[PDB]
Amino acid sequence: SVTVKRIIDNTVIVPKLPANEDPVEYPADYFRKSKEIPLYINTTKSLSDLRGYVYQGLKSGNVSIIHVNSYLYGALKDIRGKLDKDWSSFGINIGKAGDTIGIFDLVSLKALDGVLPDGVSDASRTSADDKWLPLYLLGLYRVGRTQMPEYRKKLMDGLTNQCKMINEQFEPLVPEGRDIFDVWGNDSNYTKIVAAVDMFFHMFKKHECASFRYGTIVSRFKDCAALATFGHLCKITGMSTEDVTTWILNREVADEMVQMMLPGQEIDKADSYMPYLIDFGLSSKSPYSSVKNPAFHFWGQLTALLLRSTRARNARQPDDIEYTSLTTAGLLYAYAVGSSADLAQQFCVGDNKYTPDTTNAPPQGRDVVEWLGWFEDQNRKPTPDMMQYAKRAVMSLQGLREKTIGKYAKSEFDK
Amino acid sequence: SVTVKRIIDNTVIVPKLPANEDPVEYPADYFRKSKEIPLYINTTKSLSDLRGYVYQGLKSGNVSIIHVNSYLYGALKDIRGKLDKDWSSFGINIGKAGDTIGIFDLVSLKALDGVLPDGVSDASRTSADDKWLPLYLLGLYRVGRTQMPEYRKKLMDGLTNQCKMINEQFEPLVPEGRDIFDVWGNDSNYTKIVAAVDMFFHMFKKHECASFRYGTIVSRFKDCAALATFGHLCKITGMSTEDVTTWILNREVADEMVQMMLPGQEIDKADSYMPYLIDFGLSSKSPYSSVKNPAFHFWGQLTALLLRSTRARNARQPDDIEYTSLTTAGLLYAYAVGSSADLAQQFCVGDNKYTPTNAPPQGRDVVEWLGWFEDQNRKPTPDMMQYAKRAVMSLQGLREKTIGKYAKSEFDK
Amino acid sequence: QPDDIEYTSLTTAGLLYAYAVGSSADLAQQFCVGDNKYTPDLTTNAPP
C-alpha cells in the first residue's frame, strides 16, 4: 500500500491527510522527570482574615481564586490521619507504619504576593470554618463541571449536605452557565487541592470529614471514562477481563486497548495518583479518556446497551469511527452473551446435575473462536435471529437524547 | 468528438459554452514569488493609548481596525518560545536548535498614514493587556464567521472564557447582521495576525497564553474542507488513504483528488504555512476547498452518511455535478464497507482462529466489487437499496440543500 | 415553463435522455496498486 497510481495515464499519486499529534501522556512518564507535584499557595498571611474575605466575596461579587486556595489550605491543615499500613505510589513514598500524615503531605510552595482588600476584613464570621465552608468551596467544583439545568438540581444537594450538625443557608445568587465559580476549573492549584482532598479521604474513608468527598469525588478518574466502561463491560457480561479482551474484533479497538493497558501505570492499584492524573497536572492528554478511545468506547457501550445496560442509554456517540464495523462486532458479542446463559447448579443435597447428558445453530458457550467460525459460516452477515434480538433490545427505550449511542442503536435496529 | 454536424443539411456546428477561470493557487507557488509574508501594522505609537483606544471604541459602535491591529501587535509581544527541535516550512527557515523565537517572526512592515483620535484618550483601564483583551479581540474573528443565530450561541464562548482568571463581561453594541466586528475578517493584516497566533500556539501547546486559540483556531485549514472530508472518510471506513483513493470511481473525482494531492504542498506536515493559506494571503482560491472539489465532497460525504456519519447529515449539496453517477459510486462504496465487516480475533490464550453464485464479494477490494457490479448489469441491487433505506430512514429535522436531505429523498420512498 | 412548445415530444425526449444518463452510471476504477478491474464480458429487450 505504498505506491498508488492513476491508471489512465500511468502516473503516481500520494494520498495523505493532515497530521494529528496531540499525543497522550502517561502518569508514569511524568514522575520520571520530576519527583514532586508543585501546589502553589500564594498568600500565607492570616488564616482568620481569609475566612471573612471569602465569605463576603462569595456573597455576590468576584471572589479571588487565590483567596479560596489560601483559605482551603489553612482550614484543611488538619494533620489528622493515622496510617494503617504503607502508602507508596510511582516511587514516591507518602507513608509508613503508623504515620500521622495529613492531607497536604504533597509538595507546597509559595507564589506571588498580590492581595486584594488588605488586612483584617470583617470579624463578622465565627468559627464554623472547617465545619462547612471547605465543603461548600469544594462542592462548587462538582457544580461547575456541568452546563445543563442539572446545575440547579446539583446545587440543591450541596446546600442540603452542609447541614451535618451545622444547618446554615446558601450564599451566591447568580445562575451558572460557566461565568461565576467555573473559572476555578482552569486553576491548577484549585484542582490540585480538590484532588488531594479526594485522595486523602479515599485512603481514610472512616475519617470524620470524609463528607468533603461528596463534591470532590468527580475528580477521581477524571477523563478516564474508557477504563470505567471496560470495567462496566466486564460486570455486565460477567466475563473475565481476559475473555473480554479476547472478544475485541476490530484493529483500532485493539490498538486503544493496548494503549490503555500499558503495564507500568498502576491503574489497578488501590490508592494511587493515577486516578487524578488530570487535576494534579500529571498529564495534558488522558490516555484513558473517551476522546482518545473512541472506537473502544463506542463498541463497549453499544455491546453493554444490547445487554440492557442503563448507563449506556445516554452515552455520547463519538465521531470519526467505523460505525458499521464496530456495530456489527458489538452485535456479534452481545448476541453471543445473550444467547449463552451462564446457568449452572451451585448448591445441592448430594444430588447434582452433570451437564454431559440444528446445522445453522449458534455455538454452545461464549468462546470467541467458535462464534467467529459460526459467523464465517453465516456469510459474514448478521442473521435474522440476532437482528430480532437487537430489535427487542432497543425497542421500548423512551426519551433518548441526540448524539447518544442509545439513539444510534434504536435508529439502527428498530425500524 | 471534434467535429459535429447537423445531419439534415450536413453543416458543421461547434458546441461551446462560457469559460470558467478562477484557477487554484497553491501555497508553494507563493513562496516561489516572494520569500516573506508582509504584515502591515500602520501605526507604531503608544501601547497604553492603544489600550484606552480599543476599550473606548468597543463600548460604542465605532472602532478602527488599524488601532486594534496595532494594539494586538503591541500586547502580543510574547517572545517566549523555547524551540524543541527545528522549524522550517516551504523553504522558509523560522527556527533552529534551541532558539527563543516569537509570534511575529513572520515578517512585519509599516503602512500608510491615517489615524483617528487625539493622542491620550482615556487612561482608565490598566494591566488589561496580556490577560484578556487580545483573547477577546481574537475570538471576535471566529464569532464573525457566521450568519444564523449561531452567533448569540457563539458569544457565550467569549464571555465565559474571558472570565477565566480575568473575569470581565458584556461589551458589544449591536447583536449581528454583518455590522459590528464581522468586518474585521476583511482586513488582510488582522487575518494575518490571527493566523500567526494560531500557528505559534499550534507549535507551543504548553504555553501560558494558549487560551488565545479559542478564537483563531477557526483559521486553521480555513477553506480546506475537502481534506477534512477525505480524512473523515478514511476514519469512517477504517481504510488506508491508498485504499480509499482506489475506491474513487468517477473521472472528475479523480481529477479533484489529483489536484488536492499535489506533492509539494506540505499538507501532512505538522507545523506548516499551508493550513493558513487563506488568512496569510498565500492563496486567493484554495485548491483544497469543497467549492473547487464539488464532486469529491459530495461523493465522500454521501458515503460517510450511508456509513452512519453524524456530521455528514448537514453537509451542503453542491451544484453543477453528476448527482446520479456520484450517488451510484457512493452507494456501492458504502454498501461494500457496511456489508463486509472487519471482524478478526485480536487476543487469545494460545488458541487462535484461522479464517481461510451472484453473491457480494468477500472483502473490500475495488476490483471484486466492480466485477460483481458488472455481474449485476451495472445497477444497484434491491438489497443495496434496502440497505440505503435502513441507513437514511429515521433521520430527524434535516435542513434544505444538505446531502442528508438529498440522501433521504433519494433512498427513502 | 415556456409557452407554445411541444410539451409531449420534448418531455418524452428529455425522459429518454435522463433515463439513459441516470440508469447507466459511469463508474470505472481510477486508481490502483497494480491491481486493476478488467471489464471483459438479457440479450433481447433490455436497456443498453
Q: Where are the domains of chain A?
A: 36-218, 221-414
Q: A382: number of CA atoms within 13 Å, CB side?
A: 25
Q: Which amino acid is at B205?
A: K
Whole-angstrom Cα distance, residue B169 to residue B163?
7
- Contacts of B126-130 spanning 24+ positions with Cβ under 8 A: B126/B48, B126/B51, B128/B51, B128/B55, B129/B47, B129/B51, B129/B74, B129/B75, B130/B75, B130/B76, B130/B78, B130/B209
Whole-angstrom Cα distance, residue B248 to residue B197?
37
For chain A, say whether C11 makes contact (Cβ under 8 Å): no
Alpha-carbon A111 to chain mean position: 31
Whole-angstrom Cα distance, residue A134 to residue A213?
11
Closest CA to B167 of A360, A141, A183: A183
Work out the burial of residue A105: count CB atoms within 10 Å of its CB; fewer than 13 is exposed, 13-18 middle, 19 or more buried. middle
Cell reading at B111: 503602512
DSSP 8-class letter at B103: T
Whole-angstrom Cα distance, residue B83 to residue C8?
74
Residues of B in Cβ contact (< 8 Å) with C27: 249-250, 325, 328-329, 332, 370, 373, 378
Residue B324 CB partners (closer than 8 Å, separation 6+): C21, C22, C25
Burial B251-270 (b: 16+ CB within 10 A, else e): ebbbbbbbbbbeeebbbebe
Whole-angstrom Cα distance, residue C10 to residue A29?
74
> Taking the CA atoms of chain B, what radius of gyration do you get in angstroms?
27
Chain breaks of chain B after residues with C–N above 2.5 Å: 356
Residues of A in Cβ contact (< 8 Å) with C32: 4-5, 7
Q: What angle do CA A281, A294, A385 make, to 5 degrees?
A: 150
Subunits touching A (CB < 8 Å, at least 3 pairs)? B, C
Identify the sign of the CA torsion A150, A152, A155, A157.
negative
Cell reading at C44: 433481447
The three-state secondary structure class of B4 is: strand
For chain B, say whether C35 makes contact (Cβ under 8 Å): yes
**CA distances in angstroms from A290 to A101, A230, A320, listed in the order given:** 35, 11, 13
Strands A4-6, C31-32: parallel, antiparallel or unpaired by DSSP? Answer: antiparallel
Whole-angstrom Cα distance, residue A17 to residue A30?
31
Do residues B163 and B169 lie in contact, with contact meaning Cβ atoms separated by under 8 Å? yes
Cell reading at B368: 471484486
Whole-angstrom Cα distance, residue A45 to residue A48?
9
Whole-angstrom Cα distance, residue B70 to residue B64?
10
Subunits touching C (CB < 8 Å, at least 3 pairs)? A, B
Do residues B310 and B301 lie in contact, with contact meaning Cβ atoms separated by under 8 Å? no
DSSP 8-class letter at B105: -
Closest CA to B277 of B178, B198, B184, B213: B198
Closest CA to B214 of B155, B165, B255: B155
H helices present in A170-320, as ranges: 188-203, 213-216, 225-237, 241-246, 251-260, 294-306
To the nearest whole angstrom, how far is the Cα of B177 from the nearest Cα of chain C? 36
A332 contacts B353? CB cut-off 8 A: no
Work out the burial of residue B378: count CB atoms within 10 Å of its CB; fewer than 13 is exposed, 13-18 middle, 19 or more buried. middle
Q: What share of chain B is helix, strand, coil (3-state, %, to 5)?
A: 40, 5, 55
Give, to the nearest 10 degrees, the angle between helix B323-339 and helix B382-392.
90
Residue B333 CB partners (closer than 8 Å, separation 6+): B237, B247, B249, B303
> If residue A5 lies in a helix (H) or strand (E), which one and from where to where?
strand A4-6
Dihedral, A122, A123, A126, A132 alpha carbons, nearest 10: 30
Residues of A in Cβ contact (< 8 Å) with B226: none
Whole-angstrom Cα distance, residue B390 to residue A115?
63
Q: How far apart are the first and last CA of chain C?
A: 31
Nearest Cβ partner for B267 among A8, A16, A373: A16
Whole-angstrom Cα distance, residue B278 to residue B223?
7
Dihedral, A410, A411, A412, A414 alpha carbons, nearest 10: 60
Work out the burial of residue A58: count CB atoms within 10 Å of its CB; fewer than 13 is exposed, 13-18 middle, 19 or more buried. buried
Whole-angstrom Cα distance, residue C17 to residue B47?
69
To the nearest whole angstrom, how far is the Cα of C33 from the nearest Cα of chain B? 8
Where does residue B140 fall: left (phi above 0), alpha (psi -120 to 50 degrees), or beta otherwise?
Answer: alpha
Whole-angstrom Cα distance, residue A142 to residue B107?
46
Domain B221-412, CATH class in plain words: mainly alpha
Whole-angstrom Cα distance, residue C5 to residue B218?
52
Closest CA to A222 of A277, A282, A284: A277
Q: Which amino acid is at A10?
A: N
Whole-angstrom Cα distance, residue B72 to residue B209?
14
Which residues, listed in sequence order, are joined to residue A109 by a DSSP beta bridge? A40
**Does 3.40.50.300 match the CATH number of domain A36-218?**
no
Closest CA to B308 of A381, A407, A412, A248: A412
Whole-angstrom Cα distance, residue A291 to residue A295?
9
Whole-angstrom Cα distance, residue B342 to residue B393?
25
Cell reading at B293: 472539489
Alpha-carbon B13 to chain mean position: 44
Q: Which CATH number fits domain A221-414: 3.40.50.2300, 1.20.120.420, 1.10.3610.10, 2.10.70.10?
A: 1.10.3610.10
DSSP 8-class letter at B353: -
Give the B window 352-391 contacts with A, CB below 8 Å.
352-353, 355, 359, 362, 390
Whole-angstrom Cα distance, residue A215 to residue A142?
5
Residue B299 CB partners (closer than 8 Å, separation 6+): B248, B250, B253, B326, B329, B330
Residue A346 CB partners (closer than 8 Å, separation 6+): none
B163 contacts A249? CB cut-off 8 A: no
Residue with cell 509539494: B264
Identify the sign of the CA torsion A251, A252, A255, A256.
negative
Closest CA to B259 of B279, B236, B230, B235: B230
Residues of B in Cβ contact (< 8 Å) with A379: 359
Residue B185 CB partners (closer than 8 Å, separation 6+): B141, B144, B145, B191
Whole-angstrom Cα distance, residue B316 to residue A81?
62
Alpha-carbon B291 to chain mean position: 12
Which residues of A sit in the known binding site for RNA?
142, 151, 205, 213, 285, 316, 401
Whole-angstrom Cα distance, residue A280 to residue B258?
48
**CA distances in angstroms from A152 to A63, A132, A177, A219, A317, listed in the order given:** 21, 20, 11, 20, 26
Residue with cell 415553463: C1
DSSP 8-class letter at A100: B
DSSP 8-class letter at A4: E
Residues of A in Cβ contact (< 8 Å) with C33: 1, 3-5
> Taking the CA atoms of chain C, what radius of gyration do you get in angstroms?
18
Strands A108-109, A39-40: parallel, antiparallel or unpaired by DSSP? Answer: parallel
Cell reading at B189: 493584516
Work out how many CB contacts closer than 8 A connect A with C. Answer: 19
To the nearest whole angstrom, how far is the Cα of B35 from the nearest Cα of chain A? 24
Q: What angle do CA B1, B2, B7 make, to 5 degrees?
A: 80
What technique was this entry resolved by? X-ray
Q: Which residue of B has its CA nearest to C23?
A: B379
Count the residues in chain B: 413
> Taking the CA atoms of chain A, what radius of gyration do you get in angstroms?
27
Q: What are phi and psi of B402, to 5 degrees?
A: -100, 160
> If residue B89 lies in a helix (H) or strand (E), which one and from where to where?
strand B87-89
Residue with cell 447448579: A345
**CA distances in angstroms from A82 to A79, A92, A101, listed in the order given:** 9, 19, 7
Alpha-carbon B383 to chain mean position: 36
